[PDB]
Structure 1
C-alpha cells in the first residue's frame, strides 16, 4: 500500500474492525422488510 495506495472513496471504512463474534458487538440477523398485511383498528367510541 505504501508504494501503490488504494483508491480513496468517501464510504470506505476508515477504522478497520476485526472479528467480533462472541462480543456485544456481534452481528444479529433480522428481517429488513416492513409489515405486509395491515390490521383493522376498531373505533374508540362506543356505538351506543
Structure 2
C-alpha cells in the first residue's frame, strides 16, 4: 500500500477492527424485518 494505495471511499472503515468474538462487542444475529401481521387493539372506552 505504500506504493499502490487503495481507492478511497467515504463509507470504508477508517479504523480496522479485529475478531471481536467472545467480547462484549461481538455480533449477535437478529431479524432485520418488521412485523407482518398487525393485531387488533380493543377500544379504551368501556361501552355500555
**Does the alignment reach a TM-score above 0.5?**
yes
Deviation at 1:35, TM superposition (A): 0.2
Listed as ranges, the gaps of 5+ residues in structure 2 are: none
Runs of 4+ in 1 over 2 A off after TM superposition: none
CA RMSD of aligned residues (A): 0.3
Aligned length: 48
Listed as ranges, the gaps of 5+ residues in structure 1 are: none
Deviation at 1:40, TM superposition (A): 0.1
The TM-score normalised by the length of structure 2 is 0.98
The TM-score normalised by the length of structure 1 is 0.98
